[PDB]
């Protein structure tokens, strides 16, 4: 399918144990997509002070359309040194590996895969 319905665990930034997906834009997009498929991907909501506590390159989920069955349609965009790879809408959060942290909420998304 071109899209897949997922419910992402929302994590507090200070709880996150693995603070990024890798060391290049291509690698983080690849690993984010794999973790999304495997159910091992968390979401951190972006506020002041959040991104400096995580590791670049960042992977964002951004809104791609203006929400079937409550799932916001999203796509992935990476960022490294102020340059973004991908073009999309508002940021819903930054993705990180999930390795068992306890979430504060869930964000329902329809991921363009």
Author numbering: 11 to 76, 79 to 125
Reproduce text from the manuscript describing this model.
Nonstructural protein 1 (Nsp1) of SARS-CoV-2 is a multifunctional protein with an essential role in viral replication. Nsp1 plays a major role in the shutdown of host-cell mRNA translation, the promotion of viral RNA translation and the suppression of the cellular immune response. Nsp1 is a 180-residue protein which consists of two domains: an ordered N-terminal domain (NTD) spanning residues 1–128 and a C-terminal domain (CTD) that comprises residues 149–180 and which is unstructured in solution.
